[PDB]
């Protein structure tokens, strides 16, 4: 509990892979979580995944192969199907 928040973005025709578009630790993590509620962004607690993303995938970077399926699973849960 160093607090960590990893913000993932995936859009077809833009994003060839899921992108880490923001990250935060400590106070910035808390702010990100507050912004996530304000904008109704799904937030998932997964401590090993969050720690591993934080170490490996920096802001502005695409995810790498070890993360493809764990992140896909989050996307399937979080996607707004728009109806």
């Amino acid at each position: 509990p160093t607090h960590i928040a990893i913000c993932l973005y995936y859009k077809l025709g833009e994003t060839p892979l899921p992108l880490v578009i923001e990250t935060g630790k400590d106070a910035k993590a808390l702010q990100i979580i507050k912004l996530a509620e304000l904008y109704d962004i799904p937030v998932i607690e997964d401590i090993p995944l969050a720690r591993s993303l934080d170490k490996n995938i920096h802001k502005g970077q695409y995810i790498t192969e070890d993360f493809f399926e764990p992140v896909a699973q989050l996307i399937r849960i979080a996607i707004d199907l728009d109806y």
Partner: peptide, 17 residues
């Protein structure tokens, strides 16, 4: 100013510890 918020607004999912 606002880039943080605009990135959160458009994002798909947040992973936290």
């Amino acid at each position: 100013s606002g880039s943080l918020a605009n990135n959160i607004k458009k994002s798909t999912v947040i992973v936290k510890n």
